[PDB]
Design a protein around this ligand. Sequence first.
Ligand SMILES: CCOc1ccc(C(C)=O)cc1-c1cc(NC(=O)c2ccco2)cc(-c2ccn(C)n2)c1
Length: 114
Amino acid sequence: KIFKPEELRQALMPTLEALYRQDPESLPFRQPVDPQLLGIPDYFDIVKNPMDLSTIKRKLDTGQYQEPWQYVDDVWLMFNNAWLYNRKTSRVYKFCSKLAEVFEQEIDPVMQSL
Ligand SMILES: CCOc1ccc(C(C)=O)cc1-c1cc(NC(=O)c2ccco2)cc(-c2ccn(C)n2)c1
């Protein structure tokens, strides 16, 4: 099945804005992780493939996907990175898990749609 670029944005962006809407849980994820700014200099020794909401939003704003699981792939990569780097007890890890709950709720019916 082919997917028109304007169609994905209009049908996938609601799932993305549902993540941005989570405050404060989306705050760690709205911009790429800057290890020097954040005081976590070891981040890239653990996270080899970074991803964040702003990169996803900019991709989606230029239709730079091809089918929904591509977008899913980036969102899950952002989640997996955060669960790998941050400790289970940590605020950012818990924020990530909240976002992941919201995202599964929103993405399951949009995935059934196409
Ligand atoms: C060192 C701890 O920061 C992090 C560590 C790891 C990760 C990841 C994604 O693995 C993310 C952050 C992080 C967290 C927060 N905000 C909160 O944690 C928060 C907000 C309210 C209560 O808590 C903000 C920003 C941020 C925002 C702008 N910039 C430039 N940076 C980055």
